[PDB]
Symmetry: D2
Subunit: 287 residues, 4 copies
């Protein structure tokens, strides 16, 4: 009854962002998508052309309720951070108000205050290279777009959020244990994300009584992943063979857990890393 | 519909088992109480004399749904394990079928297969003494009743559970970090419980497609809690003052998380230790 | 000079207790062996018949320094705990002072106070069965001999130890992650051991200025290891193939880490679980 | 007998770098200091003026053996990374060869190959601000100088290192648990460092058979620390009051552990975070 969620990081219907949106729809939550400018127009085209129609069906006679879809780039905090190469870039020149702060004001101006925030984005320019061979520039780019973006989102959005609101982000187990092909500083970015989730829980909890948690999801071949060296193919094969639960991991499985963590049911949970991976993380030696 | 849960470890309405029952009732789950014999009669008397009527109110008038109340002692696996003294004891004399094997059979014969199991019990003869001064017998007593009981419950109940059923137990952070005052081997018992949860998730997951998780709750002033002499009032005060979320921790806060974990919405989560403690566990240095 | 260490849990030269003895000898530490009665005679016979001469060679000719070899059974805290059957058993009949309390007194009376204690023992009657099929008695048997023994050792030995003394035990990763094959409650016992190590570090640290840590070793083919039926050859093969350091893990590798932990050079380390497993524990997905 | 260690991050004699150097000297290890250019000249002056003479005394007639002292800035990987503001800067204009790669070649050119590397440096421009208020620039600066610098050091130094060499860095527990005044992204940087230590252990272990670990040290009021909001004063007071071991934590206590991790004694340890904090990290509730 008046629940609005902003999902930062959606480019298709095969990722976690979509799965999360589908489950949140069952609870009658109004959804607002944050779309990376470079793929915003194409996404909008597919949408208008009905290419996503079947993916929006939920339960019996119920369709996903998308309030709005806005261009959004997590690498720019404010208008001042926009450089020339970007302001002059073709894909961006046509858009406006895509920095984190501009989006929060835009959302607040059109729909009022929200109470659910989802950080579901990762980006590492050198994800194909192993950590040892990742450049300083690539490493920082990974931390900047995948980790700091979480902090910035919170800084600017708590202003347009209601007390007792909830925030979640997605992480991967490579931050705690070694996963050979998860390079480019992505493992580093996930390690910082998980630690920052704890520190943020303290600050947001004491100052605004807002909760924040992160979901350590299992493999799901998709947009990003598929750019990981391939790599995602093995992760899935291994997961489906050695995980305590031999069922297929769906985006809606992360979605339903996200839904719970964003509702008042989770009232007493904050600063945690919740594993939704069919229990794969508990194994040591594969049978 | 057709959701049946057996809660093992209820002696009154001031514990987690009760808060868990109320919350499950909100989702229309049929409840079956497993009550420790020493307090079975008192509990029932109070129930009949309507001393729990107020505590059974859920949602506008909706009253808790209790299907049955059975005498249950987690120390005995089968009738063969019951010693002469206990069998002749004044509070056990007129009771029957209270061992773990007998209760599984009784529930099966009377209601068919169930799909939700809650282990909400702990016991330690020497809890007032610190670990170093705990005797072998007291240590093993704590482990037997607090940890092994989970394993035994699983062994006998898996035969009367449907596939995709869910099982949860309750633990405390003293298993991972030092909490002076939590003696008698209770900390040892919790560590074993948390480890056994992972191992059982593997066995129960692969062989029966059944899940098992454990909830690490924050301090609650219950009978078991006060048994430690108070330690509990300190734990509660400290928690309400240093946790990132400064609010009173209610038994129903754990209850709602338990309902989520017992429902099919947590389908991809197993073998985990979920913290429901207002975030206290993430803190290192207070303020 | 004046460094005396009691090693509890030696039955031959193929285990960690031996590798630990050799390494301590390199630093001129006087060694006292605590041998399980069932194998006391065989061990001694072999020692006298010079069947260990080769294995006692440390550094150019320097030979191991064994101060004494005592019958020791970790199941008994005091002489009062010894049951009629064990007392009359063929291998215990002619032996005396083998309980934990009696050995502490004997060592004290004969050599004075010591300053180094090594708990290198484990036992589980039902180790061949998986956790789910382990009986209450077998579970408690595992916990009693493998975990409680550490606590008891501490209680009686703190009276005969100097301030700043050091204590170590050995654990295995199966306590934190699922290892199919490590049954009988051994995984449960290790989890309790690791948790008890932290709690005891608090008590022993504040009250006696004594330290206690535990080493989580990698796979070694010893008697206890082969008791599991082989599981061990698999663990070893897997380890030498997937660990970040591909080298054979030697008992003396654990020995040198044990010497460091037992010496005053580790003065500021206590209550910890130190992994000496060629790094295997940090891996998630193999290759 | 031919052991050389490079210590990156030394500005005075009151930090961990010095404590580590002192202990390494007892083992006859030749020491090479890496000094941040901005304070290189002042440091050199004090040295020449004998201001550090007393701090170099070790044991009886033994003085610390400093092979060399070179200007070193962990924020520049190669000569090409040097910008104008720096090349034109007064403090730098007078120096040359202070980038990571230049130092490795310089060291290799003068003294040959080394076998011990210590990363002991941290720097966060906004360490006084809480994480929520840290800018993107400050966050990345913290990760760049405190975390990436580890990766870069390894990349360029493995070339001048011998097989079986060892590397260590220093970290703090704020990466795992919340520490209110440890801001500026320093907690984030430590979280990434610890995770990267694992990934690097895998790559360095398999490719060059080189080990890498990190030491999670306890409070020690010093150069950096004292710039933390003060903050270090409380940390120490708390540590000395609630830690299991009530002794003062000295820089040489970290030193002796570092010494062990850098020697062949640690042969089987890699990718680990070793706590040297008098056990403070194991506590939950303070007595
Ligand atoms: N790929 C996988 O299987 C796993 C996914 N999750 C996490 O879930 C998140 C999304 O993963 P997927 O759904 O697989 O990926 P997608 O399905 O690739 O989602 C990532 C989104 O990030 C957006 N993005 C990239 N750079 C951006 C920028 N600068 N500003 C704004 N948006 C930007 C993309 O346009 C895209 O919609 C990531 O944080 C990932 O680490 C966690 C573990 C494994
Ligand atoms: N209250 C607290 O502070 C915390 C509670 N939880 C855990 O929740 C569970 C229950 O705790 P509370 O609700 O506080 O306690 P209660 O509220 O004391 O619940 C424990 C129940 O166990 C029953 N019981 C004891 N021995 C038994 C046996 N041999 N057979 C059958 N039933 C037996 C008692 O009769 C009682 O109803 C325990 O596992 C406890 O460790 C976890 C962390 C903290
Ligand atoms: N071998 C391995 O793969 C691993 C060994 N370690 C641990 O190292 C310790 C010893 O292991 P190993 O050297 O492999 O075994 P051994 O080499 O089998 O050492 C165990 C010793 O315990 C003694 N023992 C058993 N029950 C006893 C009792 N009641 N009283 C006195 N002594 C008793 C045996 O006689 C034997 O000498 C155990 O705690 C084990 O769990 C830890 C992880 C893996
Ligand atoms: N301060 C403390 O009590 C703690 C210290 N340790 C860790 O030990 C390390 C050093 O700490 P302390 O000895 O207290 O500090 P110092 O004693 O302040 O050592 C830090 C060194 O970093 C150097 N440095 C800064 N920026 C540099 C750059 N761009 N290039 C090259 N060198 C640079 C400084 O000149 C200084 O010598 C840090 O990584 C810190 O996090 C770990 C936990 C707590």
């Amino acid at each position: 009854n008046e629940d609005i969620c902003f999902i930062a990081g959606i480019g298709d219907t095969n990722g976690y962002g979509w799965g999360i949106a589908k489950e949140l729809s069952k609870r009658n939550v109004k959804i607002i998508f944050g779309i990376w400018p470079p793929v915003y127009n194409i996404f909008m085209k597919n949408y208008k052309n009905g290419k996503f129609d079947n993916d929006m069906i939920i339960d019996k006679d119920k369709k996903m309720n998308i309030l709005d879809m806005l261009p959004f780039d997590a690498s720019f905090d404010t208008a001042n951070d926009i450089d020339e190469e970007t302001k002059n870039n073709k894909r961006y020149n046509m858009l406006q108000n895509y920095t984190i702060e501009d989006v929060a004001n835009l959302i607040h101006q059109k729909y009022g205050k929200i109470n659910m925030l989802v950080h579901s984005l990762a980006n590492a320019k050198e994800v194909q290279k192993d950590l040892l061979n990742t450049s300083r520039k690539g490493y920082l780019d990974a931390l900047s777009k995948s980790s700091y973006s979480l902090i910035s989102l919170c800084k600017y959005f708590v202003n347009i959020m209601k007390p007792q609101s909830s925030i979640i982000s997605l992480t991967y187990h490579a931050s705690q244990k070694v996963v050979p092909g998860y390079g480019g500083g992505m493992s580093s970015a996930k390690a910082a994300l998980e630690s920052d989730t704890r520190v943020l829980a303290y600050h947001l909890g004491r100052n605004y009584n807002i909760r924040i948690n992160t979901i350590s999801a299992g493999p799901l071949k998709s947009r990003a992943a598929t750019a990981i060296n391939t790599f995602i193919d093995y992760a899935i094969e291994y997961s489906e063979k050695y995980a305590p639960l031999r069922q297929k991991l769906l985006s809606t499985d992360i979605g339903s857990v996200a839904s719970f963590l964003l509702s008042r049911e989770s009232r007493a949970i904050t600063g945690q890393t919740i594993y939704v991976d069919n229990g794969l993380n508990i194994m040591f030696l594969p049978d």
